[PDB]
């Protein structure tokens, strides 16, 4: 039902396989701080975790995940996997508990993107679980 298939969104593995990024003084899974299952993702300092997917282009579709901030603030969105990256949508949060997070976006004609759970700052610092991407229609 439109549902994009996002392997290790759940960061139910307990690695970050399926999973990239850079830097961050903290970029590492978490059992603690999990919002289902035993593990989610955690993000603190300079840094981000990314994902890559593939979608159908010029098509609408909803980025949705769970997201706890514990200090600072988060940015939660998607772009193009590019020089120059077009970023589609974006979201800056500082909810203190996990809360659903949804961006609608549209594609392009590129269909490679890239999602990405970002910390600008070292007093940045949050979690994410459940990091899905579906086609409305």
């Given at each position: 039902n439109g549902d994009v298939q996002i392997p290790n969104g759940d960061f139910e593995t307990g690695n970050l396989s399926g999973w990239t990024g850079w830097g961050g003084t903290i970029r590492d899974i978490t059992a603690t701080n999990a919002y289902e299952g035993?593990?989610?993702?955690?993000i603190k300092g300079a840094g981000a975790h990314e994902k890559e997917?593939?979608?159908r282009p010029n098509t609408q579709y909803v980025l949705?995940?769970?997201?706890?901030?514990?200090s600072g603030?988060?940015?939660?969105?998607?772009?193009?996997?590019?020089?120059?990256?077009?970023?589609?949508?974006?979201?800056?949060l500082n909810n203190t508990e996990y809360q659903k997070v949804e961006l609608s976006f549209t594609t392009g004609s590129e269909t490679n993107l890239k999602l990405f759970l970002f910390a600008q700052q070292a007093t940045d610092e949050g979690f994410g679980d459940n990091f899905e991407i579906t086609s409305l229609g």
């Open positions: 035993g593990f989610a993702g955690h997917v593939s979608l949705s995940a769970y997201i706890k901030v514990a603030n988060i940015i939660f969105g998607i772009k193009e996997n590019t020089a120059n990256a077009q970023a589609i949508a974006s979201t800056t």
